Amino acid sequence: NQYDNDVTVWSPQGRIHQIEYAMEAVKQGSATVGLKSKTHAVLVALKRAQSELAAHQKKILHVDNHIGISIAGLTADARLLCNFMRQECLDSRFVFDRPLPVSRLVSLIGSKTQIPTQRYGRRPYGVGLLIAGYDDMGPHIFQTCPSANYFDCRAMSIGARSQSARTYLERHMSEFMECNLDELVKHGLRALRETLPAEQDLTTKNVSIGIVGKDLEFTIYDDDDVSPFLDGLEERPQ
Amino acid sequence: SYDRAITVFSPDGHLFQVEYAQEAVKKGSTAVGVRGKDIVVLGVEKKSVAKLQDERTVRKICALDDNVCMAFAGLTADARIVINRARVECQSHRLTVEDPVTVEYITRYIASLKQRYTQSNGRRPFGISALIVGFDFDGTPRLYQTDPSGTYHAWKANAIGRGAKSVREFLEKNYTDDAIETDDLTIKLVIKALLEVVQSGGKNIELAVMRRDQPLKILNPEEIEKYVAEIEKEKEEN
Amino acid sequence: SRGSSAGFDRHITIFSPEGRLYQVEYAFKAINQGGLTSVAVRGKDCAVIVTQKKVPDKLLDSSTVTHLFKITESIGCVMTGMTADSRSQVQRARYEAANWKYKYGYEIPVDMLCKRIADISQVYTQNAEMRPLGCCMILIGIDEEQGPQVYKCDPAGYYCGFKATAAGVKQTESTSFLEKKVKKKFDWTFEQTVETAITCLSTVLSIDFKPSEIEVGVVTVENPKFRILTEAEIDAHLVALAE
Amino acid sequence: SSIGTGYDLSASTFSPDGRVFQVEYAMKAVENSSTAIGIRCKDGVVFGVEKLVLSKLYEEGSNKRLFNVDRHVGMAVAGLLADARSLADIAREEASNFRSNFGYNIPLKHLADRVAMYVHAYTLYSAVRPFGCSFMLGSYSANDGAQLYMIDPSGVSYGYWGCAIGKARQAAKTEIEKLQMKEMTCRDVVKEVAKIIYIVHDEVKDKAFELELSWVGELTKGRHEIVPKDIREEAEKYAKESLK
Amino acid sequence: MEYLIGIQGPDYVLVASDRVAASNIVQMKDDHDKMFKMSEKILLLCVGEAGDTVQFAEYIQKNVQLYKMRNGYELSPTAAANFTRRNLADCLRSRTPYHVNLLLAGYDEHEGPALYYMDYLAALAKAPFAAHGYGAFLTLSILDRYYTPTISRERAVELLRKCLEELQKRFILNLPTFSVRVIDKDGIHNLENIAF
Amino acid sequence: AKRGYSFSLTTFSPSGKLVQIEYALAAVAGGAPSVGIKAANGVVLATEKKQKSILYDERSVHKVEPITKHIGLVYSGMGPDYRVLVHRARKLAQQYYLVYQEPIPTAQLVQRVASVMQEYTQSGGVRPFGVSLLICGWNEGRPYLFQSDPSGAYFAWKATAMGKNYVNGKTFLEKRYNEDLELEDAIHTAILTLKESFEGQMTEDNIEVGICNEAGFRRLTPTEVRDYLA
Amino acid sequence: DRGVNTFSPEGRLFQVEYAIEAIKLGSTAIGIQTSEGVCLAVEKRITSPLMEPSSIEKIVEIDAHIGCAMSGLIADAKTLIDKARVETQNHWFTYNETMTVESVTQAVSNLALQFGEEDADPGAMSRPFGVALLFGGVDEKGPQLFHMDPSGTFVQCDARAIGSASEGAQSSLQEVYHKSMTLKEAIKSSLIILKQVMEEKLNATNIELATVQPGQNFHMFTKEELEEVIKDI
Amino acid sequence: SRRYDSRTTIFSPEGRLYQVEYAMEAIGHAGTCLGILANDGVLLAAERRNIHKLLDEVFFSEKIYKLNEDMACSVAGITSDANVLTNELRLIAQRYLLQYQEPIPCEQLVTALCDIKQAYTQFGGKRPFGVSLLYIGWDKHYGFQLYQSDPSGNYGGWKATCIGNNSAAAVSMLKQDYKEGEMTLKSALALAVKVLNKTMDVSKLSAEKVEIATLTRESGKTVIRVLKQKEVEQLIKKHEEEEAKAER
Ligand SMILES: [Cl-]
Ligand SMILES: [Cl-]
Ligand SMILES: [Cl-]
Ligand SMILES: [Cl-]
Ligand SMILES: [Cl-]
Ligand SMILES: [Cl-]
Ligand SMILES: [Cl-]
Ligand SMILES: [Cl-]
Ligand SMILES: [Cl-]
Ligand SMILES: [Cl-]
Ligand SMILES: [Cl-]
Ligand SMILES: [Cl-]
Ligand SMILES: [Cl-]
Ligand SMILES: [Cl-]
Ligand SMILES: [Cl-]
Ligand SMILES: [Cl-]
Ligand SMILES: [K+]
Ligand SMILES: [K+]
Known about the structure:
This is part of a larger assembly, with eight protein chains of eight kinds.
Chain D: H1 21-32, E1 36-41, E2 44-52, E3 66-70, E4 73-79, H2 81-102, H3 108-121, E5 133-141, E6 145-151, E7 157-159, E8 162-165, H4 169-176, H5 186-200, E9 209-215, E10 225-226, H6 229-241
Antiparallel strand pairs in D: 1-2, 1-8, 2-9, 3-4, 4-5, 5-6, 6-7, 9-10
Helix pairs in contact in D: 2-3, 4-5, 5-6
Chain F: H1 19-29, E1 34-38, E2 43-48, E3 65-66, E4 71-77, H2 79-100, H3 106-119, E5 131-138, E6 143-148, E7 154-156, E8 159-162, H4 166-176, H5 183-195, E9 207-213, E10 216-219, H6 222-228
Antiparallel strand pairs in F: 1-2, 1-8, 2-9, 3-4, 4-5, 5-6, 6-7, 9-10
Chain H: H1 18-28, E1 33-38, E2 41-47, E3 64-66, E4 71-77, H2 79-100, H3 106-122, E5 131-139, E6 143-149, E7 155-158, E8 160-163, H4 167-177, H5 185-199, E9 210-218, E10 221-226, H6 229-242
Antiparallel strand pairs in H: 1-2, 1-8, 2-9, 3-4, 4-5, 5-6, 6-7, 9-10
Helix pairs in contact in H: 2-3, 4-5, 5-6
């Protein structure tokens, strides 16, 4: 291949391989699940350890009081995008005193992520994000990719073995709109569980949860703060 | 401006451009420095001057400050840049701070300069290694050496250039207090280790000595040939 | 040893062993990629532009499909080659003409506009980062001093004045046609020049076209205003050929 | 039809037969995208787009391919949607700059001309790649009447009575030719726009789809907006039942 | 307000500078040195604005030193004086100019003893003798009166004495101690400081 | 948006030859022939202006150009590249006049123009000029003839030729040219050197010729060229 | 030939993966997070007995409460270390407090993929850093140890090793770690594992040892103190 | 873009710079250019490569440049690059004068240009200057001096040296003949003609094919002259007359 070293080179098929190569980086990261009810937006992510001696990686990050993200792909590209999102949310509060609507923040990512895909010597962002937010229009779940494209979704999963989680949510997507918050998180956890191999299941050390909605600001529960959600578990079946 | 990455990592994890610059120093003239008790002495060789050429110009012993001098090996044109950058820095440390430069500091600057040339756009690394000789204000003797990579270490004695592996190995066998006892025998130690690898003849040897409180001395081809006599009187006999 | 190559001389605007610029030479072939032929002729009292107006379907707004352009009240041009490339050159020509008047206070001469476009075209020929423009600009207009003018510029940066000129796919056949009409000295009136231009394009392509199938722009000593002829006025000169 | 190795990597390099393949390959990206449609009526302009449902997990109304570039101007896009949005942003800024400088709504032809210049600029250099999409611009006023334009990756723009871009641009155009749009009201045109999308759609290669519809005419008072759920569903039913 | 003075003889240059570091109405220092060593045989005596003098003097000092390291030999007293003249003149029509009045004494192996006078405007003049500061107004006449170009060092120190005694008697400011140094063939020699 | 290449497009080959300069030399060696002759009391410069078609307007563009009141130009090679050098030469001639209030010595113009040519053999993202210049001038009561080329090198000539048949035109001049010509004689031997390489019949429209003397530099009118063509 | 910001078909940056490989040539370094302090240890890799002992500095001080163990290309590391030192003192100036070990590591991690060719500054980075770092210290969250590589990724470790013999030392720590280990056992373990994975015998002058415990600041061990911890083999 | 980069300022596997060594080859094909240092002066002697019946001879010299009151240089390589460097040499010389108000010492001027040429081998991605330079001059420190400049940016002080065509043959010829500390300008002028005659291509030698410039210290002033045609004629013929006295 010679149509795959630069983002400014189109393939004869009508494609950009360097965008698609960056899209591979997302799939290699550990799975993360986003879903919403009429009142809440919930992020559930799988922490990963390189060895048992090392701690688990951070998957869910703070953006603003009303917006939170879960990452998949390169760490530095995720941290760079997180800081841009934070800066945009800060500028919005600094100028207008009101929180930046989720739709518009994602549009800014879509515009910013597009720039490097069209300039020589630059590269696409090696991260895909699941964005959970709450504004005047209620709860939102958004999806971004290495390609500047973004989607408004009822529920989504990205990362390794996210297809299994995707199918779970697709069956129960009509369920979510009338869901209680506790029932909504269990749905998110149950989809994330499908991604794991049969030998292993969700533990208090490897599960991260982010919640934002009408009731409260974006909160991250990690270790001891996570077990309330895991306890009350319908058993892993086949 | 020229924005191309010149020095990059190889698949095996090698910096080829830096490694090629180390090939340039290995092609360089033999340079040896040794720390004594009361004095420090440098010696430089592989001179091979056409005897139609005025040799006052091609001297490889340079003074950076009142209390600091250095010897190099490799691309002599590159050395001149480094030497004069270090000479400017010697006067700036004197302007920003009252104190004269410590030997370790000037070594650290030269090393930081070379390192910067391995990670900056548009430029190739320097093709020289340096041997830095000086005294502290408290009077304790210091000898250091650098290389194209940007690393620096202190040495009791050392050699760089062609025949470095050979002369270095000699110094390991010949570096004891019996050789460092006097100021004369340390000078003799240089000449002996020098005459050990060069195309023989004290006529090709320029060496410098500096005492704890004295100004730098470049030696007469008379004075060094007097010591070449004390080696040949004690070679057929010893 | 004609046509030899070495290095990147086929890809960027650098010299071949022969001393040619292939990228410039390819830019001329891009003019033919338009699939159209342009002809311009000069009279004693006028300059005439003519080009084929091809409309693939009735879904296209026919009024918006044109290669006839106005740079100035007095100066017009016909564009041959890549459509988008041509439009960029037209916009830059208007910029240069209006810019000229702001600096110097008089209407830009047809010859001067052409040279300016040619000098800019030259830059794409010497700098490696950008391709030449695969298009061709034939300018017309009346110089207050030197009579009617017809000028043409290149992707190569070559520019010149002409008695008559063609551009595009059927260029080579139509320049030969024009040479035969030049040798014999007619009375170069408005009708003579318009018809010489129209008959030239109707023979090399062999169509005998409807008024809707061609475009005609004129410039005249009495009326130096650049005018595109529309259907009803072309139809008059077409039934005037069949007399 | 293509050129390997050398002449197709950069847009600053001409091919031996006078072609810029980088533009042509970017033109291929739009040909792969789902079909976007738009036809000029007697009293306005209507847009129709097939939007292929990648997953049922996405919201109804996600990946909007119909944009508001200005209050009176609507944009219909086909191709790499990421590029389509940046061009939508460029077009927005141009319509904004015009009002800031001249004090009134941008004439559609000029808006198309201006955005086309920006597109074309990305076809000349090795430093950047061409835009991988094609887009239409539609407007209506009492002064200028109904107007419809379309821009492609090369930077070319033309006026239209009927226009289509994407997968089945050919299947659409032959179906558009059938209509007497010069006499049709824009309420009628929606029905026909809806059925042509359904005919064009491949229900045996592509999995499923949603239909996007836009207004810009006298019934909207000259403002570009979305076709209501009521009027769309009447036109969707019309499309399904005259498919026999 | 400070005082500088130089007397050039047939084979030597005698220089003297006051040792006061004054701020508003107080003498902060009794033993401040206003001489700068540029070479083995070049002294630069500086006077003027409080922060500007030392910064400028040391900048020139460090560049004369840089020249020595880069070339293995020192600048001639003339080349030095002309270098410092260039640096001041270039800052003249700038946003920040240096208000420094200086005196360069030196010995060249070829030309001999040299004494240079320089304005804050950066006008350079070579003189057999010169003085800076308000004291010059009271001492330049004494110098004019008894100076011969063939003056011996013994007589020159005596002539400086006559000038410094005048500063005690008639000058309003209190300058009780002075630095005295001689430049010649052998270099710079620190001489007994003259106290009153 | 754009930003140019910052690396040289003319580099040393293992043979020690800057190939792009020699390739630029090939561009001029294949262009229409041009000749210049220094003639004791003036200078003459002539070129083949055969447009190879009757459709062209022979009066519209010129190859022999004035740089200032006392300096003229001809070229062999690429027309577009030459135009750049003419414009640059005219500006340099004015830059000199504004500073010194004295007509630029021909030698000084050539040096300044040759330096511009040198730039394009070392600067990034550019190819060298595919033109060799023939510059005439009158200053200090002396005629001057100079040659500038793609290398950035310049030469002084009593007489020379360039372009097509530059080798045959040069030997012809060696035998034919003698020092201490009158200017009107030089126009003859200039047109004669041009006839050696022609191919076709010479009309006053086919060739272009300029002259330089104590009265300045001017291009000969078509009527004047006809009178010499016999 | 390709650019420095090129993705592999796999989904990684070549220059990053190659920088990871450069560390596999660096001398091995171990950090251990004890509930009562953090110990850092590294092999010097003496090439000649002529080289000065204390000349090599692969464990340095960043702040009173922070220590950093380095492996890989030493020259790349010391540029990053100065940046770490600058950040702590900038933060001290602005906030009148000591930085957390996490934030210090996070600050160094921001320089991660800040390299490129086109659309960059004159002095912008051409490549990544061929270095791995172990940040070990004590803040208000007890004793902590962090690991960082050229991908920018950083994470806390209860115990970690990096360098040439990384997997060998990683397994040796794996079966010899209690989260309740004492500091006496912590230094011991690192000294025991170090001799096993090395090509040279453990001398008092052969290695560097450092401790950061709640009570006392970061401490560089003196040859005599090293002989007391090498007394218990 | 990087597809078109020749990567001029880059290292070769052996640890050498290609463009610099390729530039060296260009010098070899240029004119033979020698410099010889004497007790009462120093001279340059160079082969003219611009020769023709039709050349005009307007300038004093082809390859000799006056840079300073007390310094001159000669050139070998690409003449355009030579013109760029010599003009720069004249500038550095004047900047030093302006600053210190005394002429620039010989070694220092050489060092300055070498720093520019060396910079062209390290950064900027440009081709180096394909020129070697021979400097001759007088300063108040080291008296009469001769220097050699490489395209590498490396320099050295010589008593006798040569660059250009048949360079290595010319220097070993000088290595035998040069009498250290005993050389007068008359001796050095005769040696120049001797070395040139053997080294040059067209064989007989001519006053149109060689260029000689002498630097002398006369009456407390440094005098530089490019030798007249009548002078070169007598220099060639004195060697010719001695070539006829070499047989019996
Ligand atoms: Cl894609
Ligand atoms: Cl990563
Ligand atoms: Cl995914
Ligand atoms: Cl400085
Ligand atoms: Cl730097
Ligand atoms: Cl070595
Ligand atoms: Cl200096
Ligand atoms: Cl003033
Ligand atoms: Cl570049
Ligand atoms: Cl032309
Ligand atoms: Cl000037
Ligand atoms: Cl004229
Ligand atoms: Cl990575
Ligand atoms: Cl690692
Ligand atoms: Cl040359
Ligand atoms: Cl650079
Ligand atoms: K890239
Ligand atoms: K003033």
